[PDB]
Amino acid sequence: GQRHSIVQPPAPPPNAFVEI
């Protein structure tokens, strides 16, 4: 609403259905 500490949420790469 006003501002807070650096907002940089890191998203963890999700696995895919059978990579190989």
mmCIF entry with sequence, helices, sheets and N, C-alpha, C, O atoms, coordinates in Angstrom:
data_MODEL
# 
_entry.id   MODEL 
# 
_entity.id                         1 
_entity.type                       polymer 
_entity.pdbx_number_of_molecules   1 
# 
_entity_poly.entity_id                      1 
_entity_poly.type                           'polypeptide(L)' 
_entity_poly.nstd_linkage                   no 
_entity_poly.nstd_monomer                   no 
_entity_poly.pdbx_seq_one_letter_code       GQRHSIVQPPAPPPNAFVEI 
_entity_poly.pdbx_seq_one_letter_code_can   GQRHSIVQPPAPPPNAFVEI 
_entity_poly.pdbx_strand_id                 A 
# 
loop_
_entity_poly_seq.entity_id 
_entity_poly_seq.num 
_entity_poly_seq.mon_id 
_entity_poly_seq.hetero 
1 1  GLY n 
1 2  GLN n 
1 3  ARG n 
1 4  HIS n 
1 5  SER n 
1 6  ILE n 
1 7  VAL n 
1 8  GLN n 
1 9  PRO n 
1 10 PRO n 
1 11 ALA n 
1 12 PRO n 
1 13 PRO n 
1 14 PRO n 
1 15 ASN n 
1 16 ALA n 
1 17 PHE n 
1 18 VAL n 
1 19 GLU n 
1 20 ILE n 
# 
_struct_asym.id          A 
_struct_asym.entity_id   1 
# 
loop_
_atom_site.group_PDB 
_atom_site.id 
_atom_site.type_symbol 
_atom_site.label_atom_id 
_atom_site.label_alt_id 
_atom_site.label_comp_id 
_atom_site.label_asym_id 
_atom_site.label_entity_id 
_atom_site.label_seq_id 
_atom_site.pdbx_PDB_ins_code 
_atom_site.Cartn_x 
_atom_site.Cartn_y 
_atom_site.Cartn_z 
_atom_site.occupancy 
_atom_site.B_iso_or_equiv 
_atom_site.pdbx_formal_charge 
_atom_site.auth_seq_id 
_atom_site.auth_comp_id 
_atom_site.auth_asym_id 
_atom_site.auth_atom_id 
_atom_site.pdbx_PDB_model_num 
ATOM 1  N N  . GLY A 1 1  ? 0.827  -1.202  0.000   1.00 0.00 ? 1  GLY A N  1 
ATOM 2  C CA . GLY A 1 1  ? 0.000  0.000   0.000   1.00 0.00 ? 1  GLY A CA 1 
ATOM 3  C C  . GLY A 1 1  ? 0.864  1.256   0.000   1.00 0.00 ? 1  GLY A C  1 
ATOM 4  O O  . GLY A 1 1  ? 0.502  2.268   -0.601  1.00 0.00 ? 1  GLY A O  1 
ATOM 5  N N  . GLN A 1 2  ? 2.005  1.183   0.677   1.00 0.00 ? 2  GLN A N  1 
ATOM 6  C CA . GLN A 1 2  ? 2.914  2.322   0.748   1.00 0.00 ? 2  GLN A CA 1 
ATOM 7  C C  . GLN A 1 2  ? 4.305  1.928   0.265   1.00 0.00 ? 2  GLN A C  1 
ATOM 8  O O  . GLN A 1 2  ? 4.892  2.602   -0.581  1.00 0.00 ? 2  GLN A O  1 
ATOM 9  N N  . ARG A 1 3  ? 4.827  0.833   0.808   1.00 0.00 ? 3  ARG A N  1 
ATOM 10 C CA . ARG A 1 3  ? 6.155  0.358   0.423   1.00 0.00 ? 3  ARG A CA 1 
ATOM 11 C C  . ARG A 1 3  ? 6.803  -0.394  1.582   1.00 0.00 ? 3  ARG A C  1 
ATOM 12 O O  . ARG A 1 3  ? 6.648  -0.016  2.743   1.00 0.00 ? 3  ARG A O  1 
ATOM 13 N N  . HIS A 1 4  ? 7.529  -1.459  1.257   1.00 0.00 ? 4  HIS A N  1 
ATOM 14 C CA . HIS A 1 4  ? 8.197  -2.257  2.279   1.00 0.00 ? 4  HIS A CA 1 
ATOM 15 C C  . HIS A 1 4  ? 9.596  -2.653  1.819   1.00 0.00 ? 4  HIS A C  1 
ATOM 16 O O  . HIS A 1 4  ? 10.097 -2.143  0.817   1.00 0.00 ? 4  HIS A O  1 
ATOM 17 N N  . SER A 1 5  ? 10.221 -3.563  2.559   1.00 0.00 ? 5  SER A N  1 
ATOM 18 C CA . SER A 1 5  ? 11.563 -4.020  2.217   1.00 0.00 ? 5  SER A CA 1 
ATOM 19 C C  . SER A 1 5  ? 11.568 -4.699  0.852   1.00 0.00 ? 5  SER A C  1 
ATOM 20 O O  . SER A 1 5  ? 10.667 -5.472  0.528   1.00 0.00 ? 5  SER A O  1 
ATOM 21 N N  . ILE A 1 6  ? 12.595 -4.401  0.055   1.00 0.00 ? 6  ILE A N  1 
ATOM 22 C CA . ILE A 1 6  ? 12.726 -4.974  -1.280  1.00 0.00 ? 6  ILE A CA 1 
ATOM 23 C C  . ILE A 1 6  ? 11.858 -6.223  -1.426  1.00 0.00 ? 6  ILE A C  1 
ATOM 24 O O  . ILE A 1 6  ? 12.128 -7.252  -0.807  1.00 0.00 ? 6  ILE A O  1 
ATOM 25 N N  . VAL A 1 7  ? 10.816 -6.124  -2.246  1.00 0.00 ? 7  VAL A N  1 
ATOM 26 C CA . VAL A 1 7  ? 9.918  -7.251  -2.462  1.00 0.00 ? 7  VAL A CA 1 
ATOM 27 C C  . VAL A 1 7  ? 10.324 -8.029  -3.710  1.00 0.00 ? 7  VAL A C  1 
ATOM 28 O O  . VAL A 1 7  ? 9.884  -7.719  -4.817  1.00 0.00 ? 7  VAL A O  1 
ATOM 29 N N  . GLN A 1 8  ? 11.166 -9.041  -3.520  1.00 0.00 ? 8  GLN A N  1 
ATOM 30 C CA . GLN A 1 8  ? 11.627 -9.858  -4.641  1.00 0.00 ? 8  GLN A CA 1 
ATOM 31 C C  . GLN A 1 8  ? 11.473 -11.342 -4.322  1.00 0.00 ? 8  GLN A C  1 
ATOM 32 O O  . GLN A 1 8  ? 12.462 -12.027 -4.065  1.00 0.00 ? 8  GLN A O  1 
ATOM 33 N N  . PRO A 1 9  ? 10.262 -11.831 -4.336  1.00 0.00 ? 9  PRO A N  1 
ATOM 34 C CA . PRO A 1 9  ? 9.959  -13.263 -4.043  1.00 0.00 ? 9  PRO A CA 1 
ATOM 35 C C  . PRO A 1 9  ? 10.561 -14.196 -5.100  1.00 0.00 ? 9  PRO A C  1 
ATOM 36 O O  . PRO A 1 9  ? 10.268 -14.045 -6.286  1.00 0.00 ? 9  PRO A O  1 
ATOM 37 N N  . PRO A 1 10 ? 11.382 -15.138 -4.697  1.00 0.00 ? 10 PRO A N  1 
ATOM 38 C CA . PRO A 1 10 ? 12.020 -16.103 -5.635  1.00 0.00 ? 10 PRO A CA 1 
ATOM 39 C C  . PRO A 1 10 ? 11.157 -17.340 -5.852  1.00 0.00 ? 10 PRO A C  1 
ATOM 40 O O  . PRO A 1 10 ? 10.779 -18.013 -4.894  1.00 0.00 ? 10 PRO A O  1 
ATOM 41 N N  . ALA A 1 11 ? 10.847 -17.637 -7.105  1.00 0.00 ? 11 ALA A N  1 
ATOM 42 C CA . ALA A 1 11 ? 10.032 -18.801 -7.408  1.00 0.00 ? 11 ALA A CA 1 
ATOM 43 C C  . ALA A 1 11 ? 10.918 -19.999 -7.762  1.00 0.00 ? 11 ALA A C  1 
ATOM 44 O O  . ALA A 1 11 ? 11.755 -19.892 -8.659  1.00 0.00 ? 11 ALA A O  1 
ATOM 45 N N  . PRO A 1 12 ? 10.755 -21.114 -7.091  1.00 0.00 ? 12 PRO A N  1 
ATOM 46 C CA . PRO A 1 12 ? 11.566 -22.331 -7.366  1.00 0.00 ? 12 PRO A CA 1 
ATOM 47 C C  . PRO A 1 12 ? 11.100 -23.053 -8.634  1.00 0.00 ? 12 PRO A C  1 
ATOM 48 O O  . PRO A 1 12 ? 9.924  -23.403 -8.737  1.00 0.00 ? 12 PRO A O  1 
ATOM 49 N N  . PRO A 1 13 ? 11.979 -23.277 -9.583  1.00 0.00 ? 13 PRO A N  1 
ATOM 50 C CA . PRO A 1 13 ? 11.620 -23.985 -10.852 1.00 0.00 ? 13 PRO A CA 1 
ATOM 51 C C  . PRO A 1 13 ? 10.911 -25.316 -10.586 1.00 0.00 ? 13 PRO A C  1 
ATOM 52 O O  . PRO A 1 13 ? 11.467 -26.176 -9.904  1.00 0.00 ? 13 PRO A O  1 
ATOM 53 N N  . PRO A 1 14 ? 9.718  -25.498 -11.102 1.00 0.00 ? 14 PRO A N  1 
ATOM 54 C CA . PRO A 1 14 ? 8.952  -26.758 -10.911 1.00 0.00 ? 14 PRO A CA 1 
ATOM 55 C C  . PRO A 1 14 ? 9.352  -27.834 -11.916 1.00 0.00 ? 14 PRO A C  1 
ATOM 56 O O  . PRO A 1 14 ? 9.677  -27.533 -13.065 1.00 0.00 ? 14 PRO A O  1 
ATOM 57 N N  . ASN A 1 15 ? 9.325  -29.089 -11.476 1.00 0.00 ? 15 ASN A N  1 
ATOM 58 C CA . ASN A 1 15 ? 9.686  -30.202 -12.346 1.00 0.00 ? 15 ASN A CA 1 
ATOM 59 C C  . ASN A 1 15 ? 8.609  -30.422 -13.407 1.00 0.00 ? 15 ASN A C  1 
ATOM 60 O O  . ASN A 1 15 ? 7.440  -30.109 -13.185 1.00 0.00 ? 15 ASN A O  1 
ATOM 61 N N  . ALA A 1 16 ? 9.007  -30.961 -14.556 1.00 0.00 ? 16 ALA A N  1 
ATOM 62 C CA . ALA A 1 16 ? 8.061  -31.214 -15.636 1.00 0.00 ? 16 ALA A CA 1 
ATOM 63 C C  . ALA A 1 16 ? 7.743  -32.704 -15.731 1.00 0.00 ? 16 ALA A C  1 
ATOM 64 O O  . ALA A 1 16 ? 8.519  -33.541 -15.269 1.00 0.00 ? 16 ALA A O  1 
ATOM 65 N N  . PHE A 1 17 ? 6.601  -33.029 -16.330 1.00 0.00 ? 17 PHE A N  1 
ATOM 66 C CA . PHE A 1 17 ? 6.196  -34.422 -16.477 1.00 0.00 ? 17 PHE A CA 1 
ATOM 67 C C  . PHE A 1 17 ? 7.225  -35.196 -17.294 1.00 0.00 ? 17 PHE A C  1 
ATOM 68 O O  . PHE A 1 17 ? 7.249  -35.107 -18.521 1.00 0.00 ? 17 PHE A O  1 
ATOM 69 N N  . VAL A 1 18 ? 8.074  -35.952 -16.605 1.00 0.00 ? 18 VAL A N  1 
ATOM 70 C CA . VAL A 1 18 ? 9.102  -36.737 -17.279 1.00 0.00 ? 18 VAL A CA 1 
ATOM 71 C C  . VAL A 1 18 ? 10.024 -35.831 -18.085 1.00 0.00 ? 18 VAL A C  1 
ATOM 72 O O  . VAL A 1 18 ? 9.848  -35.670 -19.293 1.00 0.00 ? 18 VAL A O  1 
ATOM 73 N N  . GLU A 1 19 ? 11.007 -35.244 -17.410 1.00 0.00 ? 19 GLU A N  1 
ATOM 74 C CA . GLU A 1 19 ? 11.953 -34.355 -18.077 1.00 0.00 ? 19 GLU A CA 1 
ATOM 75 C C  . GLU A 1 19 ? 12.433 -34.970 -19.387 1.00 0.00 ? 19 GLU A C  1 
ATOM 76 O O  . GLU A 1 19 ? 12.267 -34.383 -20.456 1.00 0.00 ? 19 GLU A O  1 
ATOM 77 N N  . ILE A 1 20 ? 13.029 -36.154 -19.296 1.00 0.00 ? 20 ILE A N  1 
ATOM 78 C CA . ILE A 1 20 ? 13.530 -36.840 -20.481 1.00 0.00 ? 20 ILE A CA 1 
ATOM 79 C C  . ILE A 1 20 ? 12.545 -37.913 -20.934 1.00 0.00 ? 20 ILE A C  1 
ATOM 80 O O  . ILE A 1 20 ? 12.795 -38.602 -21.924 1.00 0.00 ? 20 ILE A O  1 
# 
